[PDB]
Structures are given as structure tokens and as C-alpha cells.
């Protein structure tokens, strides 16, 4: 028959075996992640070996069905995802060692302990423990001990492993005709579909860098303001024209500045826009947090969570002897099995995260209608952005008041508006440079621009120049500080958190216009607009079936990242910030460090 008819039947074969093998792999991964055991590590590795072996043989077979001779775009797109394999192209010994490296790096990170010098018996994991210090402590020494002790105990172990990791990951990328493993990662944004909807891997770097130029003035001012207000909390440790010490940024990495909110709130006598204390005082639990997020999605027309979700998910650390990996994640295990793994605390951050993860599920639930090869996000940024459209609404004073976390006599003035905008900025603007600078470093390592001998030299040079953050302790090439972040040790690409943040507001601007909202888009609560949920679900249900440039142009007007909605959303905080910084220095000197003092 036609080469199109042969490939349709080939795909139907593929879909039925893959559904089985990827389900067994997902199940085996879930039990490891929910119950870290030697037996479950072996079971995980085996099920993934069967999935990888399958997947690579099907890639080779897919090539015999040449793309040019098929005329149905859906099949043509299903075959394209099958054309480029993964680590199979490596020597069996070679892919043996790389799978070992990834398993060691992941369990070094989740088993690492750093011990108190003053108390050698008290040994702390990252989660919970070191993280509790890095979020709630106000002592320069306590945070420094945790920050440095983390990068020194597990960072130092990961360094020899990370070196082998780039050489092998790059050997796998070049064997697949990519320049390097970074080029391979940027492939996720590659779009060859229709005309005018084309996007190449190399444009992602130009576009990321052009848009980061427009964000930088707002960030410099946010930076100047929090640097001023940390001098009230850390007098004799902050230089008013310098970079900010990296252990004082509110988490283990300064990934989000949200826990600086207490130290930086402008109008603190107003009703607290951080509803963490109101949640505790009303005896909320993790269940309530997830039920409230479910209530939100139902009010916009999206479905409720499945019954299996409530039975199978891990919504708090179990504390029954099992060791868990606590990093919040939303799983589509296949066969309609949707779960969330999260060690949920009673916190506005985890309240917002639970919305973030539920949006992942909601996306996975909608593109279930698509054929197997096509049930993924349009790109990775889309996927991390659906959750954050919900957080944008769920965090508004308005929505908080309707949920009961703000008093019924609560009223919005210009001071609670700056409060809310400043907290949003600590989370969403504070993370852009941190995210940009990390993947720039990663991309440059894989490319060859940074040699092993300068890995930590360039990391702390880029931290200071781009992020305005400085290391509290000198770090030799014996260190490997970026690998102390979960996503790096666990072989995940990071630029999704950058493109997501720009996508966030493009989506939010478009759904609010559908919700017939009037006024600024930071006042907008998408809650109860079924028209808005209808518009969103139309893109969610498309999955990867259309190129992401078209998928974007179908919700919002444009076919590429636009930073204009993000800047409008923060236009009142930005004008306010400029005034608070009218007699202050905006920017940073890279020369000063806490230890050259």
C-alpha cells in the first residue's frame, strides 16, 4: 500500500506496546520515588531498560517510513517524534556507566547530609532540614553553615560525576547529529510545522537573550530595593553597592526570593497578603490545600481530579519509615492514572505549588484525547506555564478573600497592591536572572566554551555579573555548586522556567480579556469564568499535535515570547520601585565579596 498506510499501521502497533511498557516504567519509578529501596532501584532500572530498548528499536524502524511521502500532518508529526532516539546510540558499556552516573547523582542529592560543627551528632538532610534553615533563619552564620556545608558535602562528591556526565551526554548528542547536549535540549522548542510557524533551536538563544534585556531594568530595581531592606536585617554583612550574599536570599540557591517577603514588605501593618499564618490559624491541612485548588479548576470549567488521584497520590511526606524524594512533581503514569508526589506543608508557597502541580495534571488530562506520541505539552515552557496561570489568580487578594484566608472586612488600597505586587515580584521576577544564568552556564559547558579548569570560576563570575549575587566563601574547581540544585543533578533542562514566566502573562492577558475583566491584569481573578476555561482547554487538548508557535497564536495573538504583558503586570511596582531608589544606587559592583573584607 501507500507509505502513509504502512506508517499508520506501524504507529498503531507502536501505540499499543508503548502504552504498556511506559506504564510499567512509570509504576516502577513511582514506587522508587515514593519508597527508596535497593529492590525498587533495580525494579526501576529494569523497567526503564525495557522502555529504552523498545523505544530505540522503534526509532530505527520509523526511519523506513520516510517523512516526505506522507500527507497527513498528524501521522507526519507522530513519526517526527520517533526519528531521533536517545542514549541507545552509545556503547553498552558506555550507556551502562551513564545510567550509573545518573542514579548515583540522584541519590547523592537525596541522601546527602551535612553535620553541624558545634553539634556533630545533628546531621541534616536537605529536605526537611537544611531547607528549613534556608527559608526561615535570619542568622548569617546558621545560613552560611547550611549553604556552604551543602555545596561542600554533596557538591564536592558530584563534581567528578558531573565531568563524566557532560562528556557522555555530549557523545550521545553528537551521535544523534546535534552539536552538543545543550543543542539537544533546545530541540524541544524546534518547530518545522506549517509556514511562518517555523522556529529553530538557535533562535531560542537569541530570543531568550533579547527578552532578558527588557526584564533587566525592573530586576535591577527589585534588586536595589531588597538589598536596601536586607541591610536592616543583616547589618555588617551587606554592602549597599555590592552583590547580595548567596546564602541570604531566602532558599538554598536564591532560586526564588519569596521568603524575603517578611524582610522586604513595604506596608507590613496591612492585612498580610502572605496567608501562611491565616492557613495555620484555620487548621488547614494538605488535603484542604489540594481540595481548594480542585475547587478553583472546577469553577473555570476544568474537570475534577479523578478518584484514583485521591487514592494514589502522595500529598504529604508519609513519615512511616519510607524515604521519599520530596521534590514536587505531577505524574501522568498513563492509562488515565494521574498522581501528585509532594511533601506538602501548611504554607502559601505550597498552596501556590499545589495549584502549579494541579495545572500539570489538568494539562495531562486534557491531551489524553490525542494519540500517544502527541500527548505532551506544545513545548516544555507551556507545560510549566499552565500551573502558573492558576497561581496568578489564586494568589490575588480578591481570591484569597473569597477562599476565607483574608478577613471579610478586607479592602484593597494602593498599599496592599504594592504589597501583593512586590511578593509576586520576589517569586516571578527574582527567578528570571537566576534561571537565565544557570542555563547559560549549562549551555556553555556542553558547548565547550567553559573548560573543566574554569567551571566554578565562570559560575561565580556569571552569578555576580548577571544575577548580582556573590559567593560568601571562595570555591575552587574542587566544588560543583550548580549540581547542588535538584534539576541539574537529575538531568532536567531548566530554560522551561524562563520561557514559562514569559508565557504566564501572555496567557493571563488573553484569558482575562475572555473573562471580560476591566482594569490592570494583576487584579484579575479568572475564577468562575467558564469562558476562560473553555479557551484554555482548547489549547490544552491540542497537546504536541500542532507546533508550539501555532498553539501560542491560537490562544494569544502572537507566535513567540512577548515580554510586554509581564512588564504591564508589574508596571505599578516598577514606578514605585524607581521612587524608593531615587537617591540610591541601582546596580551592583562585582568586585566586593564577603570574604575579601
Amino acid at each position: 500500500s501507500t507509505t502513509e498506510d504502512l506508517a499508520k499501521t506501524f504507529l498503531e502497533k507502536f501505540n499499543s506496546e508503548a502504552e504498556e511498557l511506559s506504564h510499567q516504567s512509570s509504576l516502577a519509578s513511582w514506587s522508587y520515588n515514593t519508597n527508596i529501596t535497593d529492590e525498587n532501584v533495580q525494579k526501576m532500572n529494569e523497567a526503564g531498560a525495557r522502555w529504552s530498548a523498545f523505544y530505540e528499536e522503534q526509532c530505527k524502524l520509523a526511519k523506513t517510513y520516510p517523512l516526505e511521502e506522507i500527507q497527513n500532518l498528524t501521522v507526519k508529526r507522530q513519526l517526527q517524534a520517533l526519528q531521533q532516539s536517545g542514549s541507545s546510540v552509545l556503547s553498552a558499556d558506555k550507556s551502562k556507566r551513564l545510567n550509573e552516573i545518573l542514579n548515583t547523582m540522584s541519590t547523592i542529592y537525596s541522601t546527602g547530609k551535612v553535620c553541624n560543627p558545634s553539634n556533630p551528632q545533628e546531621c541534616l538532610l536537605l529536605e526537611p532540614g537544611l531547607d528549613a534553615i534556608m527559608e526561615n533563619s535570619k542568622d548569617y552564620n546558621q545560613r552560611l553553615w547550611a549553604w556552604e556545608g551543602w555545596r561542600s558535602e554533596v557538591g564536592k562528591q558530584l563534581r567528578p560525576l558531573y565531568e563524566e556526565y557532560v562528556v557522555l551526554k555530549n557523545e550521545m548528542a553528537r551521535a544523534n547529529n546535534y552539536e552538543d547536549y545543550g543543542d539537544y535540549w533546545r530541540g524541544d522548542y524546534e518547530a518545522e510545522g506549517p509556514s511562518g510557524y517555523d522556529y529553530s533551536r538557535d533562535q531560542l538563544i537569541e530570543d531568550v537573550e533579547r527578552t532578558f534585556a527588557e526584564i533587566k531594568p525592573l530586576y535591577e530595581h527589585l534588586h536595589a530595593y531588597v538589598r536596601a531592606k536586607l541591610m536592616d536585617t543583616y547589618p555588617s554583612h551587606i554592602n549597599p553597592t555590592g552583590c547580595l550574599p548567596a546564602h541570604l536570599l531566602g532558599d538554598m540557591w536564591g532560586r526564588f526570593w519569596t521568603n524575603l517577603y517578611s524582610l522586604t514588605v513595604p506596608f507590613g501593618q496591612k492585612p498580610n497578603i502572605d496567608v501562611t499564618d491565616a492557613m495555620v490559624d484555620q487548621s488547614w491541612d494538605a488535603k484542604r490545600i489540594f481540595e481548594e485548588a480542585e475547587k478553583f479548576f472546577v469553577s473555570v470549567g476544568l474537570p475534577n481530579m479523578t478518584q484514583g488521584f485521591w487514592e494514589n497520590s502522595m500529598l504529604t511526606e508519609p513519615g512511616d519509615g519510607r524515604k521519599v524524594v520530596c521534590h514536587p512533581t505531577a505524574w501522568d503514569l498513563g492509562k488515565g492514572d494521574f498522581r501528585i508526589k509532594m511533601c506538602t506543608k501548611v504554607t502559601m508557597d505550597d498552596f501556590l505549588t499545589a495549584h502549579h502541580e494541579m495545572g500539570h495534571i489538568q494539562y495531562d488530562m486534557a491531551y489524553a484525547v490525542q494519540p500517544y506520541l502527541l500527548r505532551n505539552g506544545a513545548n516544555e515552557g507551556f507545560h510549566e506555564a499552565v500551573g502558573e496561570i492558576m497561581s496568578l489568580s489564586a494568589a490575588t487578594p480578591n481570591h484569597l478573600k473569597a477562599i476565607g484566608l483574608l478577613p471579610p472586612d478586607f479592602y484593597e488600597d494602593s498599599e496592599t497592591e504594592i504589597n501583593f505586587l512586590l511578593k509576586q515580584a520576589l517569586t516571578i521576577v527574582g527567578t528570571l536572572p537566576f534561571t537565565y544564568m544557570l542555563e547559560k552556564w549549562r549551555w556553555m559547558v556542553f558547548k565547550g566554551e567553559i573548560p573543566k579548569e574554569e567551571w566554578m570560576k565562570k559560575w561565580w563570575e556569571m552569578k555576580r555579573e548577571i544575577v548580582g549575587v556573590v559567593e560568601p566563601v571562595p570555591h575552587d574547581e574542587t566544588y560543583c555548586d550548580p549540581a547542588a540544585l535538584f534539576h541539574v543533578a537529575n538531568d532536567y533542562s531548566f530554560i522551561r522556567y524562563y520561557t514559562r514566566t514569559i508565557y504566564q502573562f501572555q496567557f493571563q492577558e488573553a484569558l482575562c480579556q475572555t473573562a471580560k475583566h476591566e482594569g490592570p491584569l494583576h487584579k484579575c481573578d479568572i475564577s468562575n469564568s467558564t469562558e476562560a476555561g473553555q479557551k484554555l482547554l482548547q489549547m490544552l487538548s491540542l497537546g504536541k499535535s500542532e507546533p508550539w508557535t501555532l498553539a501560542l497564536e491560537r490562544i494569544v495573538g502572537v507566535k513567540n515570547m512577548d515580554v510586554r504583558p509581564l512588564l504591564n503586570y508589574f508596571e505599578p511596582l516598577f514606578t514605585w520601585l524607581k521612587d524608593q531608589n531615587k537617591n540610591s544606587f541601582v546596580g551592583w559592583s562585582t568586585n566586593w565579596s564577603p570574604y575579601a573584607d
Binding site: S1, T9, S16, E20, Q307, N312, K335, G336, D337
Partner: protein, 192 residues
Amino acid sequence: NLCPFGEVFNATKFPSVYAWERKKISNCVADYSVLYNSTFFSTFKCYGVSATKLNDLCFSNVYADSFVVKGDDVRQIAPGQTGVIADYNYKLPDDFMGCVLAWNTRNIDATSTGNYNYKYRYLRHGKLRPFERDISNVPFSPDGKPCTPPALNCYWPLNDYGFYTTTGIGYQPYRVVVLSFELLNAPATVCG
């Protein structure tokens, strides 16, 4: 002389869709109250007949077809439908007269580790005519030539269902009984 619906509905083993089984009911008294006042049927659609009036009707014979499908395929056991189950496994006629009943069987038919005993046919040359059955197990080729796997473009036509206790509802096993009611110019043998 009560009609033995309990042997069809309460049978231990059910068969796969592609190999569906049929029991002939005749010369009996058919009390459908055992069916229609019961909680467990997620699907209870009648065609050319009213569920509520079942105990007043008389027929020449009634035919009961048993098999198992995914939740998301129960919608294919209905007149006018298409898809793998309706095309290649079990096809109802458009003038169907009878009732389709299904219930969730995850407790009986799904496992922690996965139950692969139930199969369905997903490749066939041409659709099935109504109430036809194909239990042939011959490797399928789109050109239609005889081939032998592992050769290219050559596939086994029966797929296993994979029934796990943790799956979404549309992937959970459902037992299905299709009662056909037959009106012949003969006397009646099944009544209320």
C-alpha cells in the same frame, strides 16, 4: 421455570471481546427485576424497548453475549458506533433490539502487577458485519500478503488489554452482557 440470567451475569470467567460467547435463553420466565433494581450497572441502555416495561414483553428467544472491555470502549457496544471494538470485535446492527449492561470489574479483573488475559483485535481487513465473530489468529499485513513476523510491515492482530488496579476509570475492566430480544413469526418462549 425461572430464566437463568444468574449464570450469565454471575459467571466466574468472562471471555475476551474478539472471542465473545453467546448463550441462548428460551422456554423460561424472564424476571428482569433482578437487573433493573440494582446499583452496580454503570451502563444499562435499551434499544427499541423500555427498561421499565421489560417484565411485560414476550419474545421468541433472548440471546446473551458476554465479554470484557475497557471502560472507554463500553461506548462502542451500541448501534451505530465505530472503533476497534465495534469494527473488528463486536458489531451491533442498527435495528438492534435489546439491552446493553456493563459494570466495573477492577476488583475481579485487574491486578497490582497487571492482568493481560483479555485480548481484543485491533488490525483487520474490513469491518465486521453485525453479530459476526472472528477468532482467527493470522499475522496481519497491510498489502494483504501472507507474512511471518519479525518481517517489516507485519503484525500480530490481537492486542492484550492491560488491566491494572490503579488505572483511570476509562482503562478499568468492564464486564458486558448484551441481551438481544428476538421477534420471530414463531410462538413466544420468553415472557414476564
